[PDB]
Amino acid sequence: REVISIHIGQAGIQVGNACWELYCLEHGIQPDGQMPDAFNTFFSETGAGKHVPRCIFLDLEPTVVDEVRTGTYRQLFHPEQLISGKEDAANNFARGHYTIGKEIVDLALDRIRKLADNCTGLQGFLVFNAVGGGTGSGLGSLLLERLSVDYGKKSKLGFTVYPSPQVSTAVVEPYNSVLSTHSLLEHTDVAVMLDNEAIYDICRRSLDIERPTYTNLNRLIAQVISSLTASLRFDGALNVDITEFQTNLVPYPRIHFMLSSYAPIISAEKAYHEQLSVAEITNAAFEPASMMVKCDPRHGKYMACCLMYRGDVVPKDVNASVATIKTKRTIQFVDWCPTGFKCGINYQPPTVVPGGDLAKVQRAVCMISNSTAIGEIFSRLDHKFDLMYAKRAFVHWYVGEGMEEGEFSEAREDLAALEKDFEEVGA
Amino acid sequence: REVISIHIGQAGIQVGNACWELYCLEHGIQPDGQMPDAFNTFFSETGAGKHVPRCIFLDLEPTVVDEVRTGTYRQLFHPEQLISGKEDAANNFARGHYTIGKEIVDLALDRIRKLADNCTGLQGFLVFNAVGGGTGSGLGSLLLERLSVDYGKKSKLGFTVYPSPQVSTAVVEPYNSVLSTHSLLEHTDVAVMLDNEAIYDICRRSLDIERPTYTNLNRLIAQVISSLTASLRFDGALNVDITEFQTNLVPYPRIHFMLSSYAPIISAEKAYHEQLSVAEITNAAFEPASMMVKCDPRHGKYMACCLMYRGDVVPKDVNASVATIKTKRTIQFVDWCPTGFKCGINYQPPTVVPGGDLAKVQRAVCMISNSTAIGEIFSRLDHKFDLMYAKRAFVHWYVGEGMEEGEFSEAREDLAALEKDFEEVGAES
Amino acid sequence: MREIVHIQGGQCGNQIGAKFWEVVSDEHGIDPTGTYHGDSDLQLERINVYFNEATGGRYVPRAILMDLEPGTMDSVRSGPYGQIFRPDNFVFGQTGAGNNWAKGHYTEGAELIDSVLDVVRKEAESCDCLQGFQVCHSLGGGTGSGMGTLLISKIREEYPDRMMLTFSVVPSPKVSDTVVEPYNATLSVHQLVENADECMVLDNEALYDICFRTLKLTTPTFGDLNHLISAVMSGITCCLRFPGQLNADLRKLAVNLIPFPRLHFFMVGFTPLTSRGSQQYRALTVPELTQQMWDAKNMMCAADPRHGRYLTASALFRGRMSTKEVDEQMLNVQNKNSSYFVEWIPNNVKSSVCDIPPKGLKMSATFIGNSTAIQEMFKRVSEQFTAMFRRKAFLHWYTGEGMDEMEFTEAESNMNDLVSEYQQYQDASAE
Amino acid sequence: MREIVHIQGGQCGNQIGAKFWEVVSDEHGIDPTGTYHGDSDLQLERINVYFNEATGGRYVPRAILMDLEPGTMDSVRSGPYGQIFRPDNFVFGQTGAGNNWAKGHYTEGAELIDSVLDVVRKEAESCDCLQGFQVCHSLGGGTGSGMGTLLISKIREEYPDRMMLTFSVVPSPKVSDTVVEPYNATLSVHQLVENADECMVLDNEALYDICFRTLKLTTPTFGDLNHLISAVMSGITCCLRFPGQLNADLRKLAVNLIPFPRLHFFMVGFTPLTSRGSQQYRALTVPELTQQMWDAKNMMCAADPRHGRYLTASALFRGRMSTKEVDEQMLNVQNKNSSYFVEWIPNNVKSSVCDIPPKGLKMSATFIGNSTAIQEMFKRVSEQFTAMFRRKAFLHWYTGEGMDEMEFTEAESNMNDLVSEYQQYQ
Amino acid sequence: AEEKRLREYAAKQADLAANMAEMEATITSSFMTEDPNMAASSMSAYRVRKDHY
Amino acid sequence: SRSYPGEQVEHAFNSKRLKNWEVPAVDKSQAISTSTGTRFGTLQPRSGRTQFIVDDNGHLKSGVPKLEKSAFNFTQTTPVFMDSAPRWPKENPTWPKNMKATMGYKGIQSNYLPTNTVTLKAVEVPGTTERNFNF
Numbered sequence A: 001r002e003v004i005s006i007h008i009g010q011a012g013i014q015v016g017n018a019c020w021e022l023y024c025l026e027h028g029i030q031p032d033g034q035m036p037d038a039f040n041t042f043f044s045e046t047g048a049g050k051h052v053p054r055c056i057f058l059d060l061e062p063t064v065v066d067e068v069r070t071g072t073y074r075q076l077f078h079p080e081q082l083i084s085g086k087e088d089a090a091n092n093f094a095r096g097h098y099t100i101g102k103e104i105v106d107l108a109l110d111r112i113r114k115l116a117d118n119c120t121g122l123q124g125f126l127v128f129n130a131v132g133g134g135t136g137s138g139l140g141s142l143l144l145e146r147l148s149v150d151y152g153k154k155s156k157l158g159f160t161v162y163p164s165p166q167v168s169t170a171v172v173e174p175y176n177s178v179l180s181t182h183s184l185l186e187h188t189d190v191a192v193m194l195d196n197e198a199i200y201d202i203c204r205r206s207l208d209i210e211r212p213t214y215t216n217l218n219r220l221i222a223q224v225i226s227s228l229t230a231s232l233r234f235d236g237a238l239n240v241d242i243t244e245f246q247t248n249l250v251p252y253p254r255i256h257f258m259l260s261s262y263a264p265i266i267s268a269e270k271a272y273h274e275q276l277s278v279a280e281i282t283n284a285a286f287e288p289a290s291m292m293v294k295c296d297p298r299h300g301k302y303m304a305c306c307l308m309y310r311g312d313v314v315p316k317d318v319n320a321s322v323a324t325i326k327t328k329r330t331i332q333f334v335d336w337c338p339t340g341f342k343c344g345i346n347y348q349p350p351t352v353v354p355g356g357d358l359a360k361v362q363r364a365v366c367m368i369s370n371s372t373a374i375g376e377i378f379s380r381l382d383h384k385f386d387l388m389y390a391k392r393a394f395v396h397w398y399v400g401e402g403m404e405e406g407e408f409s410e411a412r413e414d415l416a417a418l419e420k421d422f423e424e425v426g427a
Numbered sequence B: 001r002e003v004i005s006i007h008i009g010q011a012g013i014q015v016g017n018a019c020w021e022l023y024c025l026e027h028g029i030q031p032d033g034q035m036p037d038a039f040n041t042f043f044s045e046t047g048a049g050k051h052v053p054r055c056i057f058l059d060l061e062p063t064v065v066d067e068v069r070t071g072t073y074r075q076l077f078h079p080e081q082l083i084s085g086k087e088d089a090a091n092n093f094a095r096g097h098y099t100i101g102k103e104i105v106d107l108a109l110d111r112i113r114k115l116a117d118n119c120t121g122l123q124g125f126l127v128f129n130a131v132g133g134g135t136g137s138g139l140g141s142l143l144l145e146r147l148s149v150d151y152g153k154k155s156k157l158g159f160t161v162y163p164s165p166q167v168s169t170a171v172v173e174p175y176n177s178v179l180s181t182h183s184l185l186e187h188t189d190v191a192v193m194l195d196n197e198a199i200y201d202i203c204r205r206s207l208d209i210e211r212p213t214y215t216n217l218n219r220l221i222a223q224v225i226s227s228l229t230a231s232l233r234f235d236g237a238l239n240v241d242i243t244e245f246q247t248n249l250v251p252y253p254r255i256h257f258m259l260s261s262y263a264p265i266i267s268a269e270k271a272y273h274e275q276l277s278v279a280e281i282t283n284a285a286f287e288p289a290s291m292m293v294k295c296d297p298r299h300g301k302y303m304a305c306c307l308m309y310r311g312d313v314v315p316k317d318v319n320a321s322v323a324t325i326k327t328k329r330t331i332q333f334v335d336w337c338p339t340g341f342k343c344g345i346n347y348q349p350p351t352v353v354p355g356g357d358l359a360k361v362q363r364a365v366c367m368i369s370n371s372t373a374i375g376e377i378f379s380r381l382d383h384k385f386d387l388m389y390a391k392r393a394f395v396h397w398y399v400g401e402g403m404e405e406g407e408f409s410e411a412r413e414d415l416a417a418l419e420k421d422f423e424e425v426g427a428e429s
Numbered sequence C: 001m002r003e004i005v006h007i008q009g010g011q012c013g014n015q016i017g018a019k020f021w022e023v024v025s026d027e028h029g030i031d032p033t034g035t036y037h038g039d040s041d042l043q044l045e046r047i048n049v050y051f052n053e054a055t056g057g058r059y060v061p062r063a064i065l066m067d068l069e070p071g072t073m074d075s076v077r078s079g080p081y082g083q084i085f086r087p088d089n090f091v092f093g094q095t096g097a098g099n100n101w102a103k104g105h106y107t108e109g110a111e112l113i114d115s116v117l118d119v120v121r122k123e124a125e126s127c128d129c130l131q132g133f134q135v136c137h138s139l140g141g142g143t144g145s146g147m148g149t150l151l152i153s154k155i156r157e158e159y160p161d162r163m164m165l166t167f168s169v170v171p172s173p174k175v176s177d178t179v180v181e182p183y184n185a186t187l188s189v190h191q192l193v194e195n196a197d198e199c200m201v202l203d204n205e206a207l208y209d210i211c212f213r214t215l216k217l218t219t220p221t222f223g224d225l226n227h228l229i230s231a232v233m234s235g236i237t238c239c240l241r242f243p244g245q246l247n248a249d250l251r252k253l254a255v256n257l258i259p260f261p262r263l264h265f266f267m268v269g270f271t272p273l274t275s276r277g278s279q280q281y282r283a284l285t286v287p288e289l290t291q292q293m294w295d296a297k298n299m300m301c302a303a304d305p306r307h308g309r310y311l312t313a314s315a316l317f318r319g320r321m322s323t324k325e326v327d328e329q330m331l332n333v334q335n336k337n338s339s340y341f342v343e344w345i346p347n348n349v350k351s352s353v354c355d356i357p358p359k360g361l362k363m364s365a366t367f368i369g370n371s372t373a374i375q376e377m378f379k380r381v382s383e384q385f386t387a388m389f390r391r392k393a394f395l396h397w398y399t400g401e402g403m404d405e406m407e408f409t410e411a412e413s414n415m416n417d418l419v420s421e422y423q424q425y426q427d428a429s430a431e
Numbered sequence D: 001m002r003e004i005v006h007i008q009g010g011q012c013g014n015q016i017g018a019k020f021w022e023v024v025s026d027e028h029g030i031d032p033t034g035t036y037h038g039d040s041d042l043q044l045e046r047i048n049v050y051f052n053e054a055t056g057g058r059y060v061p062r063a064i065l066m067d068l069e070p071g072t073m074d075s076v077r078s079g080p081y082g083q084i085f086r087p088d089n090f091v092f093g094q095t096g097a098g099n100n101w102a103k104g105h106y107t108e109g110a111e112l113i114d115s116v117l118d119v120v121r122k123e124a125e126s127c128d129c130l131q132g133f134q135v136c137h138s139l140g141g142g143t144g145s146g147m148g149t150l151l152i153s154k155i156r157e158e159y160p161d162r163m164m165l166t167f168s169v170v171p172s173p174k175v176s177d178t179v180v181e182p183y184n185a186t187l188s189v190h191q192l193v194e195n196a197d198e199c200m201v202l203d204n205e206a207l208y209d210i211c212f213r214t215l216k217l218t219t220p221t222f223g224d225l226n227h228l229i230s231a232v233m234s235g236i237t238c239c240l241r242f243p244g245q246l247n248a249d250l251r252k253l254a255v256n257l258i259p260f261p262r263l264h265f266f267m268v269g270f271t272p273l274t275s276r277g278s279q280q281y282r283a284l285t286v287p288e289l290t291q292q293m294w295d296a297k298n299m300m301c302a303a304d305p306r307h308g309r310y311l312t313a314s315a316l317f318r319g320r321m322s323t324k325e326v327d328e329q330m331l332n333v334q335n336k337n338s339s340y341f342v343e344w345i346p347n348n349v350k351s352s353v354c355d356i357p358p359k360g361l362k363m364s365a366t367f368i369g370n371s372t373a374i375q376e377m378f379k380r381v382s383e384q385f386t387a388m389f390r391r392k393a394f395l396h397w398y399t400g401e402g403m404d405e406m407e408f409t410e411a412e413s414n415m416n417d418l419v420s421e422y423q424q425y426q
Numbered sequence E: 001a002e003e004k005r006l007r008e009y010a011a012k013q014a015d016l017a018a019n020m021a022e023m024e025a026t027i028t029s030s031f032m033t034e035d036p037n038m039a040a041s042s043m044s045a046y047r048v049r050k051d052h053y
Numbered sequence F: 001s002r003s004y005p006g007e008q009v010e011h012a013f014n015s016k017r018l019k020n021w022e023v024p025a026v027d028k029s030q031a032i033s034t035s036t037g038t039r040f041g042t043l044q045p046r047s048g049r050t051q052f053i054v055d056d057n058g059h060l061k062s063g064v065p066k067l068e069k070s071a072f073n074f075t076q077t078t079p080v081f082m083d084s085a086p087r088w089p090k091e092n093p094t095w096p097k098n099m100k101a102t103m104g105y106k107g108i109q110s111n112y113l114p115t116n117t118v119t120l121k122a123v124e125v126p127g128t129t130e131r132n133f134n135f
């Protein structure tokens, strides 16, 4: 059972740069490439005493890619896995989807094809990207297009980083995000939202880091992805694969968006004061004050939930806590889903990283839900796309690149249909 | 069994600072958080070798709260339970009930929610506030309102600190007290009055400390609270829980205001000289010179009474004393309450803190009664509320803060109706 | 957390602020160079109210000096604790008002106020949660009165919710420096009564009287009057900067002392104040503090409060004190001499305690009384204003500038109606 | 990798280009001889952007210096780092334009521009993946404006794909050397609006303002102004030369700041610039940087920003910092000053961070603001142009050379329609 | 937690060091000191640089 | 979502026994229409086949009635218990507030470089327009 992870974008490979640090630490693989068989899902074992990841960092700016090439993981991160272009898309979906993607995608596609041929029990792909940028969005959509037509039936998780409502690093990222989603509709199988703003909130609230950088964000995102792949890696009392969220959380072929959360994210010092038991981490994983996406599920209705458990977890109290949540009325489900939960238990406790800010815990929970507050997010993002497109702002960049307005109008109407989808399905 | 405590205001959390010191000294818990199982009703055993109390100090000024955070009980008092705002309500019920309450109360009650979730056998909530201030009145009332809508039938024992008749620190405290009581009526299950000049008189007269501060008062209040939770904490010959005062002191859904009293509050050598026994402490808990509220029950009629006993007390002598009290005609009851008493006995004697001024005693009595002297008090307070309201003094503060005159009028007339009711209940017919 | 932004207008304002910042820096233990060198760690936790960390224990005040001639700025720089003010906060013109309220409010204000507003807004958003602004100025001069008044008006337009203190010195005819003091003070007060949140009326007459009688100094120069005023201000704001058993911020004191939005002119007093030869004989108790607080010769306004009624009053105590004694002293001073307290407001005395004494003492107290004897000084000013406006003396200096006569008429009308409202709130009935 | 071909025109261009190459060669550790003498390895991998290895560790700048009087050449060789250029890149006339835009555009260009074009074309194919061009010149003089303008038009005709910057100082009636300044400025601006990708407008008035009020210098001679402009140039190009938490090249900036093809005149600021008498009182936090960034007294243009609306803005941060603070400060400045920002573009602020501060500093910043207060500058120029063109003064110097009147009218019309569209978007 | 405290303390110490280093460098800065030695030319001892004179 | 009777374990699934301690959800438990009506009861038997209420891709057919906008909880008609804590960027008395940055103010606009100080003029007529900049 092997899963290969691709990273498309400057955020993508920075997330992968913390994620792979966690993988080598969790499997005890030294950064030069060898240990001092659970690794088989990530590290192909070449020759004798050598482990090369099943991944591709691909970007358009060479700066961060060869920064990886010159760091300490020169020997671990393999040479042809680090694809890099020559010039950027520059926050431009058109430039990254029609001009430059046409030259980078064939090379990335015939690389990953021979990675898959190396693989034997391929579970699926998982993509890492931020849709605000040009590289992550443009060729990201093109790569997912060609990946869907090449394999199709294999699962493709997507952990995307959407633009936050009020805090932003760019201006045209509404256009990039909308045009990115419009293809992420029919291409990805499960999409997971990961907003930077909510993560800033979490770092402030629990880790009480008054001044975090992107690293602390990357570090706890790696905690999440590891927490929902640990079932494939280590044996559990009730394991759940990567092809499952396919089935248990996507009721309709176009509603695949997930509000992720995690608990307990806790500091080294608050850990001494607080007891972490299964009841309270299941409660704390449902509060909006611990969600990875800045929205509010109280404003909407839960469609389904998944509950990954790690560490010292027995089945009786995960069953008791889910019962309590069902009897509580601060949260409410849709009326077309009587059985709204899916548990999953794994034995290994989450590991700590040297230089990390998280404490060592006995148990943890990674809750992946599906709700209608996502319809709230798309609407608020729809408004500020409607503002800028009312006055024909920034459109000349895309048209000068070579695209037309059919994509703009159809992407806006496709979102409008999506708003109707959320409103009607939730009825 | 567990009972969680919420402290609202600058008086609330000083009372809490005394109370939790008393609790740690009763259960032998070092200030760093670990012992060198009855503690489980106040301290939750987190992990292994650590106790974090079931309380929330909440305040708007950060001063006293981070003073606690820097004080002796750094490690014991937990990091996230002490809620502290950034700017005060400033003796302004409107500011504490509409402006800042609506931003702090949701976080407060979502902390209480997970406290109750950690809980197992919750008896009820108990709240500590002074209604003279801005915070303890305004967001005290807001918090009690939303707790009553979120829980409903659970007990909420409110030990409130009303302003004194002659000793006063504030000016708008009549407005504050009226607007706080108007919701304390229909949201508090059982309310216990605690005035300040009464306790000053007690410390001046009996404990003979000629120059006390707020700390000695807070120590006495902590003694009272411990004496009425000792039945939960320690085993007794006749133990009585928190849900009972609910049943046995409140004959009508709007009459819950309890005169508290305690005996013996005796100094270290008055104690050496005097011989202590159940009869005379039962006598001492009934005279107005030993009550916690500046009023006189001679003028009123006891509607009900509850008596917690601690220490070397056997039921025979408490029965004898209650019998003599009932036969003597110095104190009278309302006619439709022929069984006006409720006794309860607990084994453990009240403990003593080094530096505390009370001598160690073999037995003690804490009375929570009900009367119509409280109907006298509310009229005395309505007097100096209508005084300031006839000229519309200080009202612009509240109105610009976000209330209107209808709320003033309805609070005044609600207290008027309560006065009429306290008159009507005492009538025999 | 809670933030006080200090503003100083004019020459008297600048020197008052110089002594005030000296006292505050000494209280918080920062040296004349501008670095912390104190001992107790109670001093570090509440200096955000007044300072900003620059580099390694470098704290500069949250102050804005403002003037019209660089002489005052250089006199500020030359004095000790003169190198801790940031030079960006030295906004100053070059013409000079010259005891001309019109020059301070229309000609030079119109183009100096925007720069000083930029500076004050920068130092206001440099912090998180404003408690409020605290302005120190005179009502006799021009560059303090007119400019500071226009600044107050603009600030009340911009930030309408944060608190506002005005420490204003008013002229009183026994010591009369200038000749146009009524023309200045009347207009300034007419603007204050609709802009300022609350005002504390100081007076050089009262300061000199106190320094003669109580302190018995030989040569009480303006340095000692400035020190008295600074002691008053520090005793006002001690509650924010140090913890205690009953705290009271500026907004709390305002809401407990201001029963009506236009009645916000207080008289201040400070205790204890005795000679070094007479300190041997006197006892030192809280009654000894209160007997001097309530003594009518201790008010820093030149108005006998025995000639009127106390509407409300407040006391701020500093030092480890017994709240029992505090409360009972307040109680008996209210009950015994009871004719001087108004009837329709029971319990007129708000009080607060803090446990950190001012530098040099063990216990001290500050009194703020909102009385109705302040209409005395207002009438004393308005009568001279009438005496001058009848003959239209000195009027061209204002009339040739853009001002008209209806400004004076409106100022007169507002002053007279304010004293009328004070009079009938004094003579109101209980029921 | 991504390449910047630098171009300097005229005396002003040469002097600011001199300081620019001094500062850049220093932060890359290149000695006045031309050899590497830095310490870190991080400097070597991103010098191909500006230099070319000649002979055994000899890095020569990818610059072109064009002018019309040898005094500029002597002033180039006079200072240090004066022998690090290439004498082949000293393409240079002999006569001198002399405050005559037509002389700079029709008579001397006809024989100078071919050789400059040969040089820049050879310098363009010397690199593999060219990123764009950088042009530094003036709008008052003749040999800088006219000759540089013609090269702009020719270059945009040959390489219409790559990026293009223009640092242009503009004349002002408050500090004015010559009297034909509007005649040169209007024609040059008239050509820049169709040819230049984007223009970052400098001004000597605002620079004197900064050096007098913020810096409190005694004699701010041109050397200091050239160094401030140099500080701007290094800041605009830091992203290509150093890795960071979030990179943003020139093309990424132009996309995020230019909503309309004619709205490409930005005002620029630079922090930190504090007087050494007040350096003891400063704190070093990104609060202290952004308070000096949005300050109107720190713009390097003579336009009060709060007289109009910010269309878009960008912040380029250098130094080890916390994105959380960077992004929330941008959040606060946008939400409080709600009136000074345009309404139909939410999130007007692009931001980027590069972990390498300039040498000797720990934290710096650069601001690029596309505001609609720039029409103040152009109206101020257009009114003097009309005041002169009513009576046709100083016209014979131009019309006697080949230029005709319709060029002036066309200059008026594009200036007016430009200002009309900024005033519309306000 | 002890490790994190130590790392924080070292980071703060180094931040103070860099702060003071920048302060000193930019105080002794050639501009803030207005050095006329910058006006000297390379190719003579008499002729001066045109800009920095 | 609904919670059905377990008939053996509901004695252990009482909300009070699960440390809920609040007023529990009985919406989920009344929607069942059991025989007794309480949580201790037997469901009703069902017969036949269920026709399709919804169209494809989850859109209700025109004939069937629905609640107008029921996927969400609007603030006007939500109860008080369904209220969330505010997230980070909104100012709250709990977490500290970073400063704001405000557009500065260039100096007094004169014909020469603007400054922050006014000077004494030698010539002053109402129409003077006559200054002395050099110092």
Ligand SMILES: Nc1nc2c(ncn2[C@@H]2O[C@H](COP(=O)(O)OP(=O)(O)OP(=O)(O)O)[C@@H](O)[C@H]2O)c(=O)[nH]1
Residues within 6 Å of the ligand: A008, A009, A010, A011, A012, A014, A015, A060, A061, A088, A089, A090, A091, A092, A130, A132, A133, A134, A135, A136, A137, A161, A163, A169, A196, A214, A215, A217, A218, D245, D246, D247, D252
């Ligand atoms: N959570 C998180 N987001 C990041 C990180 N790095 C960059 N981003 C996000 O990435 C988005 C912009 O895209 P970039 O990563 O800068 O670059 P890009 O995605 O490759 O797009 P281009 O710049 O056109 O190449 C911004 O919204 C950032 O918030 C990171 O380390 N963590």
Ligand SMILES: Nc1nc2c(ncn2[C@@H]2O[C@H](COP(=O)(O)OP(=O)(O)OP(=O)(O)O)[C@@H](O)[C@H]2O)c(=O)[nH]1
Residues within 6 Å of the ligand: B008, B009, B010, B011, B012, B014, B015, B060, B061, B088, B089, B090, B091, B092, B130, B132, B133, B134, B135, B136, B137, B161, B163, B169, B170, B195, B196, B214, B215, B217, B218, C245, C246, C247, C252
């Ligand atoms: N009995 C008793 N009362 C106290 C104590 N501390 C303060 N108070 C009372 O508190 C009342 C004023 O309110 P405070 O508690 O000081 O402050 P607050 O209630 O939080 O209201 P704000 O000032 O707006 O913050 C006064 O009536 C005091 O008598 C105390 O330790 N014991």
Ligand SMILES: Nc1nc2c(ncn2[C@@H]2O[C@H](COP(=O)(O)OP(=O)(O)O)[C@@H](O)[C@H]2O)c(=O)[nH]1
Residues within 6 Å of the ligand: C009, C010, C011, C012, C013, C015, C016, C097, C099, C138, C140, C141, C142, C143, C144, C145, C169, C176, C177, C178, C204, C222, C225, C226
């Ligand atoms: N207490 C005090 N009063 C002062 C001081 N300086 C001036 N005054 C008084 O202020 C009044 C005139 O104020 P003025 O100097 O004109 O204020 P200006 O506008 O700043 O010049 C005079 O009556 C002085 O007695 C001082 O330092 N302290």
Ligand SMILES: Nc1nc2c(ncn2[C@@H]2O[C@H](COP(=O)(O)OP(=O)(O)O)[C@@H](O)[C@H]2O)c(=O)[nH]1
Residues within 6 Å of the ligand: D009, D010, D011, D012, D013, D015, D016, D098, D099, D138, D140, D141, D142, D143, D144, D145, D169, D176, D177, D178, D204, D222, D225, D226, E051
């Ligand atoms: N900032 C700056 N401005 C300059 C410099 N040299 C000239 N200027 C300005 O540019 C104008 C003259 O431009 P000029 O050098 O004659 O242009 P050119 O002849 O085409 O190169 C004058 O108003 C100067 O103020 C310089 O080195 N720096």
Ligand SMILES: [Mg+2]
Residues within 6 Å of the ligand: A009, A010, A011, A061, A088, A133, A134, A135, A136
């Ligand atoms: Mg990118």
Ligand SMILES: [Mg+2]
Residues within 6 Å of the ligand: B009, B010, B088, B133, B134, B135
């Ligand atoms: Mg208080």
